[PDB]
Amino acid sequence: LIDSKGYGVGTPMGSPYRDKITIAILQLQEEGKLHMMKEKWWRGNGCPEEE
C-alpha cells in the first residue's frame, strides 16, 4: 500500500449524527458484517484452476 486514505461519511458542522454513526460503524465493524459484505460485493468470478 503506497498510500493510506479512508472513506468516511460527510456531514455539515454540528451534526448530531457524527457520533451516533461513529459508534454504529465501530459496532458493525466488530460484527465483521462489513467484512463479509465487502467480500460479496468485491467477489466477482474468483480464480480459475491453473496448475
Binding site: D3, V9, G10, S15
Partner: protein
C-alpha cells in the same frame, strides 16, 4: 456545506481540505495506492534462459 443533503455515504476522501469545511466520522474502510499488473506468461528471451 449548505445542508442540501444529509449524511452522505459514498467514496469520499477524508481530506484536511474537506474536513475543514465538512464533518466526517470514523472510517468504515481504508484506501490505498497499489500497483496493478498482469501476471507474467512465464516466457523469457532465448538468451537469458539457458
Amino acid at each position: 456545506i449548505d445542508h442540501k443533503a444529509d449524511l452522505a455515504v459514498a467514496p469520499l476522501a477524508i481530506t484536511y481540505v474537506r474536513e475543514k469545511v465538512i464533518d466526517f466520522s470514523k472510517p468504515f474502510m481504508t484506501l490505498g495506492i497499489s500497483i496493478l499488473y498482469r501476471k507474467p506468461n512465464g516466457t523469457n528471451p532465448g538468451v537469458f534462459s539457458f
